[PDB]
């Protein structure tokens, strides 16, 4: 439905149509906590500390100070809520910058910004004015023709689309246009190639509307004066918003691993409590309450400290990412999953924006005996300047390059600009202009040049034109010169098709083979000289062959083959290139060397995809490069079967429809094939299919899938991907406004993954190691005391020492791990292989958690038993035993932190000593009610030395042995 009339003031919004601000907002305040709380409190490693601190609801379970349980619970809750709210408001602030762009309007008022622009308010978009919503172009810049919009940031196609103003709206003028014109459009739907509706005028006047009559979403107007359009859809009705899935919160692999080991740790301490209660036997005979009490005692430190440490180390990780000057302006969007980087194994990359700047130029031109590079412009320049032995080759090559195309230049000011249907033509004409034979004027029935040096202006009359078309790959024109009465035909197209029409060309195959190896978009050009009457003979034949209503249109092809394109002289071939992002062709090599199966997923065409892939070293110097294009229906399984037969070592290049079919019916079989390949490339992939592939890879292989992109083409992938990165590109930011991370170019990803991610993961792993170690050591010490004296475990370290060990005395060196560096900043590039060592669960598997358990058990057992050996269990010596136990326990952590530190930074060497000397100011100063004997005699410190020596010698020796081996 949707009858839209200008003069929408009576129903201006008024809930009749949505507003145009596409905010990336989360958690409306009326449902902020009800969502965040129920989200974070479902994982066991959080529910554990919640259930611990929610004890003391029954008085029988009061293990100690209510402060020890409520305080840290509130601390973690408030810190998590604050971080989440800060991230949300920061995203809203950053998004506000693009929501209220300023758009000149014609209905009323001065220019009003977006979020005030709504259905049907005419926008006089200018030049590079990013379109705000879905438009219907009612009037162009008055060329009596069309206007161009480039889809660089909507579907990724690198070629500008053709859009034509509606036929009846070029004459109405503003007065009748505003008053009552009316239009209608179909209800919003997916896809970026369909449209339906009608324009309307007084009485029954009506005309059809088609995809070429509309400008969509963030498509950017290109190379034109201005145009008048009335928005049709807006507010999540755009073709950009409709093709994008709802955002979902994501969780880190490190969080999952810590949950999986916290399950085991809870089971372990529950088993220890059961053992203690059953061993004692006579503990009140209400053994269930006693095992519950012991469980609550043993669980008071580990999980609640783990959440604090992780959530306050994520802040350091995010600050380090956001602050580094080697990756400047890489502001992070999602504070969570900063450590997930470092365990990435797949990387689905976009082509347009991330890889190619969509800038193009004639890198090199070859025309037979020699070749000319862009740097050697001087020779061709002085050759062409004399246009008005090899001169007859080069001059005519350039004179044909400057005339055989579809470009149309226009002047907005003293400078000219190019409106053309393809960057290939744009670059060809730009090269001609640079070498001095600039195109200066264009129109039906006339093509002209402006000549440098001599200042002459050349005028040619195009007699017929054969536009570029798919499955033809040839474009040519018949040119009638009038400076000299000569007729010409000049043709341009793909070598694979033209090579059958060119002269002997004994060198063309060799040159093309050595040309395309660099990924250049090879094109060949030829000519033929005609006369006046022969053109008339051709026209008679072509006019007859153009008979309408007859199903013999191939007569025209036969005529052109007979007369025009049979023996074209070979002027030469030209190599157009895609300007890759800085340092891409080595960054890809580094990433692949680290073990990441870098793929390519693009919305572009197959030829350009292959050319960019070959240019970027994504395909090795020699590979099969299998092609699977336009396969439909299930019967394409023979392609995958032949791929298995080919036995790997053969890159795959697949069309978007083929990928969509294979991922639709042959999910598992296709995945089992593509997994072992070194690289996959997709072409013409719609925004949904990239997200589908990203989901399927993770679902099927378990590995983690990075995704990098820019523009609304990749929002659906970045949201459904892991650690999804966005690039804030020129002329648009919508992708970075929704990505998890942001970077100004693709070169940054090398450092963002190999160094920041790896260091984050290692820091978090070792920090969790130490937290669990310092929890289990005290748990084991209390359990050993209960075993060896039959007293309740809570007797040892009773009072303020539990708080002082949970926090304060020993938090600082444990947090100090998050400032270490595994390797220098620079040495990441020289040894990319290091990142591969994390490919397996080498840091948080049960096989390592149990080793930590054994080491903590030994440490605590030695501590407690040797304290008892150097003291007595009698209550007379309790205040001495507790001291020789607790001080040794604290020094245990303050020594083991220094034992497992890789590089000694200034902060660590300060904080370790500053917490040891804080403990020395601790209970030995105001703690006399516990942990106090004489504590000065030599027999005390000798025993402490012996305990510490026997405690650390195994870890020191093991570290030495396993660093020697
Ligand atoms: C509407 C919602 C309502 C909620 C409101 C809040 C309720 C109460 C708040 C808190 C409760 C208790 C928790 C206390 C901790 C607070 C932690 C935190 O929340 O995070 C905030 C900063 C982040 O840093 P900032 O302080 O914001 O300032 C930074 C900017 O973040 C940073 O962006 C700027 O640089 P770029 O990154 O942008 O380039 C920077 O200039 C500042 O503006 O948390 C932290 O500060 C985390 C700790 C920081 C790490 C410190 C050590 C590590 C760094 C480097 C190591 C190098 C070695 C040094 C050697 C020493 C030689 C002398
Ligand atoms: F090249 Be993608 F569409 F940003």
Numbering used by the authors: 154 to 541, 561 to 1137
Authors' own words:
In budding yeast, NEO1 is required for neomycin resistance and encodes a phospholipid flippase that establishes membrane asymmetry. In cells deficient for Neo1/ATP9A, the extracellular PI4P is a receptor that concentrates neomycin on the cell surface and facilitates cellular entry of this aminoglycoside antibiotic. Here, we describe a mechanism by which the P4-ATPase Neo1 in budding yeast and the orthologous ATP9A in human cells confer neomycin resistance by preventing PI4P secretion to the extracellular leaflet of the plasma membrane.
We observed a lipid-like EM density that fits well with a modelled PI4P. PI4P is at the substrate exit site, representing a post-flipping PI4P in Neo1. Glu475 forms two hydrogen bonds with the PI4P headgroup to stabilize the substrate further. PI4P binds in the same exit site position and orientation observed for substrate lipid bound in the Dnf1-Lem3 flippase. By contrast, the PI4P binding is weaker in Neo1, perhaps evolved for facile substrate release into the membrane.
